[PDB]
């Protein structure tokens, strides 16, 4: 399948080269997979989700995304226009308040929630969790992310936006999950992207168009935007049978575009998420 005039990041994920604008992907499109977006919520009524999104948990007065961040990330995973895996099922877990903040205790509970809740959902092609969030190093947050992964979920987490080594941030620094840095449309490391040995992969993160609340769209930047590209890619590849939740991060690294990015510090992978879709 070909989507013309796609957001640059979608085109990038299906290209060996920067500078193109069509997204190419197998029409299976993540059908039969599930992606949990653990964030500020998801505006499930957005036409872009086509009824494939739902809220399943909140820790706040409402399950509504009163921020937009979670809706944007969900859109990059799985919206019809802005998403990588256009037929996946999206599940929202609102661990962040409408100011985009959440206590680590809440974030941990949300991860353990997903590890159990997947057993209540129909995801025959597998389960992914996208965590476009984090803070300072916490062994408890990392352990929660490790449990979620161990439980059979492909966990993708943001590296963080500190232009610093991700070793000092969580859940970015948990080795066993898929830690995602950000790039721009010219294949530069995004200016804010964290880096370091713990990064597994980069994805598009600067100037990413996706869904927003109030049935709208906007472009924003961050490792929060790169993460759902990778989460959606994992779901897509799992639907194709090319990999599994346990192995998807490694598979994505194996099959990534190598050496394309600039300003990658020595000791950080130079790997850009790529679907290797050949029509």
């Amino acid at each position: 399948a070909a989507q013309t005039n796609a957001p640059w990041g979608l085109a990038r994920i299906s290209s060996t080269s920067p500078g193109t604008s069509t997204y190419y992907y197998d029409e299976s499109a993540g059908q039969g997979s599930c992606v949990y977006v653990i964030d500020t919520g998801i505006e499930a009524s957005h036409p872009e989700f086509e009824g494939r999104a739902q809220m399943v948990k909140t820790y706040y007065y409402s399950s509504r995304d009163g921020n937009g961040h979670g809706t944007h990330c969900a859109g990059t995973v799985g919206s019809r226009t802005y998403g990588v895996a256009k037929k996946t099922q999206l599940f929202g877990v609102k661990v962040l308040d409408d100011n985009g903040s959440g206590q680590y205790s809440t974030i941990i509970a949300g991860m353990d929630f997903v590890a159990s809740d997947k057993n209540n959902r129909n995801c025959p092609k597998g389960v992914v969790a996208s965590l476009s969030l984090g803070g300072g190093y916490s062994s408890s947050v990392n352990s929660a992310a490790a449990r979620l992964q161990s439980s059979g979920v492909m966990v993708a987490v943001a590296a963080g936006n500190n232009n610093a080594d991700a070793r000092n941030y969580s859940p970015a620094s948990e080795p066993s999950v898929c830690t995602v840095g950000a790039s721009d449309r010219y294949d530069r490391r995004s200016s804010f992207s964290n880096y370091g040995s713990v990064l597994d992969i980069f994805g598009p993160g600067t100037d990413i168009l996706s869904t927003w609340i109030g049935g709208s769209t906007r472009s924003i930047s961050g490792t929060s935007m790169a993460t759902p590209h990778v989460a959606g890619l994992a779901a897509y590849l799992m639907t194709l049978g090319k990999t599994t939740a346990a192995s998807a991060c490694r598979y994505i690294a194996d099959t990534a575009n190598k050496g394309d990015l600039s300003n990658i510090p020595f000791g950080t992978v130079n790997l850009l998420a790529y679907n290797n879709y050949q029509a």
Binding site: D39, T40, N67, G68, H69, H72, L96, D98, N99, G100, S101, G102, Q103, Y104, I107, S132, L133, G134, G135, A158, G160, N161, I220, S221, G222, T223, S224, M225
Partner: peptide
Amino acid sequence: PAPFASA
């Protein structure tokens, strides 16, 4: 605590 930008 928290995320990366109520972006």
